[PDB]
Design a binder for this molecule. Sequence first.
Ligand SMILES: *B(O)[C@@H](NC(=O)[C@H](C)NC(=O)OCc1ccccc1)[C@@H](C)CC
Ligand SMILES: [Ca+2]
Length: 240
Amino acid sequence: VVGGTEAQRNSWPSQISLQYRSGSSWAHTCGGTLIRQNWVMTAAHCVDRELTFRVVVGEHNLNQNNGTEQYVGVQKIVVHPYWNTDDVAAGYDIALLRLAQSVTLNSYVQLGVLPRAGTILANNSPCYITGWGLTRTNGQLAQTLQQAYLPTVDYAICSSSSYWGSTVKNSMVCAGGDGVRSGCQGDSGGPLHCLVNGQYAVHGVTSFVSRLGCNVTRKPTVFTRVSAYISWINNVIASN
Ligand SMILES: *B(O)[C@@H](NC(=O)[C@H](C)NC(=O)OCc1ccccc1)[C@@H](C)CC
Ligand SMILES: [Ca+2]
């Protein structure tokens, strides 16, 4: 997150950290959202490489013990059948991870709420991005969970020539674009939480930014539109 502010510890209890076994250590690579006790939602591109992954829930500081973490192995990865690595702008940036164990829910560990299928947010809807990715372009990871106020930009505006043009599809959500705040490398997979009917719901799964840099004016962060997948999400879990 470029332009963010440290989150309060208790604030976004469905946020996970997706990591891979790096040497003797475990390196953070993405965000996710905990959608069942034993399922996490993330971007397929997080899982292009065949690594060893684990999920951390109740996470706040990457580098210290918070007293709240649970660390689960990733037993099974289901990427959208149509996802194509060479073509992020085709969409389908979404994957589900079935966890080796069910995590225990508490004050720090809750399920994230998904939107009803088909829901589309009005322009300039009040959303937040969270995650531990780069705090500048070509910067470095946040140690603590960062949140940025990231108001949506509707399709019509987003696909206009002076924003993304054609590269954005109606299966995506755009948010921010102000040149100050954004997601960055290390935020992919993560939530875009928006306030619908006084619940935060997870509408976005961070996908991509500009090749030019993370916080580029009139290139908002682009997220997989969750409400476009609901029936796919439910079919996976019902079937695995
Ligand atoms: B998440 O790990 C990461 N996302 C990506 O690297 C995606 C897959 N690609 C990307 O941002 O490519 C740049 C591009 C290419 C083609 C059209 C438009 C943009 C981070 C960067 C997301 C916060
Ligand atoms: Ca910690």
